[PDB]
């Protein structure tokens, strides 16, 4: 019971190098209440593996089992397998949801797939259903999934498989694809993707996940905040306690058109340069932002948005730190939402050796501390970037 801490683990984090290298055993069993495995896949209309080393074969334990092995040390921990995401696209979801036969084919493939691999549930990450057909068919998919999960539980006399989904924060995306009252009814809980509010696809700097929109925001764009998105879902009929609010352990980066104009909503020429470990322009892991702040980068706290950004030369990154995360946890409690979701567990300072505070998982550890009252350790102090970094 209490607030949830829902952590996404991404299987491609296994390929990162040096400090970035992450494996299932790097997760502390007591860190999260739920771990979601990103991702499974779809083949011939049925739930399947993303990559062969997810599976256990011949002598060799796969990633699925290494993640689920965490439940031996913490029997209260729940695991789910996610299907979807950006690589997956939309066409495969369209075809799988379009007819009852295709939906049932997926569903009766999904139940044994999960049970045989000791998963406690399924997370749907269709990004995104769009238009009237998708809007109806998505509901039909969740309805028939929940239906079948309910029946299975009673027949096998085991706790029912959980059904969850990751959902968008953009008002237009929400309106086009989501019959919210029906969607919420069939889901156990809802992982609100409260990040990617801004990024290199825009011509000015903007924060990845502002709690509140800056005053320099046009009036369309002030809709783009964590606060506005979460309350929009409530207004549309989602129960507050089913809303698990996403928290990014990453930032979105820009290259400033002029290094002297570095505030939020400043002209940008494109994405920030790629980090060594995540190798993606416009994007940095939290521990990559830490490296910047520990090597000459300047830190700005925006008291309007209640989030920080960092500047180094013409490089600009909007990210979340221990300060903004704790304030967001207070906002979760003040609004009675269901808990925090994290994207991802593998981009926090999981080794505890990069950001300088010598605490493993400073960000997620802070979430657990604020929401579930569990200490990060005796002398675990937040990094005060205001004094540590430049200004």
Numbering used by the authors: 91 to 481
Task: Pull text from the paper.
Here, we report an arthropod-conserved insect chitinase belonging to group III from the pest Ostrinia furnacalis (OfChtIII), which contains two GH18 domains that act without synergism according to enzymatic assays and structural investigations. OfChtIII contains 987 amino-acid residues and is composed of four domains: a predicted TM domain (residues 7–29), two catalytic domains, GH18A (residues 94–461) and GH18B (residues 530–889), and a CBM14 domain (residues 922–976). The two GH18 domains of OfChtIII possess similar structures and substrate specificities, which differentiate them from the chitinolytic chitinase OfChtI-CAD. The degradation activity of GH18A and GH18B (or GH18B-CBM14) in combination towards EGC was equal to the activity calculated from the sum of the individual activities, suggesting that there was no synergistic effect between them.
In addition, the structures of two complexes were obtained: wild-type GH18A complexed with hydrolyzed (GlcNAc)6 and an active-site mutant, GH18A-E217L, complexed with intact (GlcNAc)6.
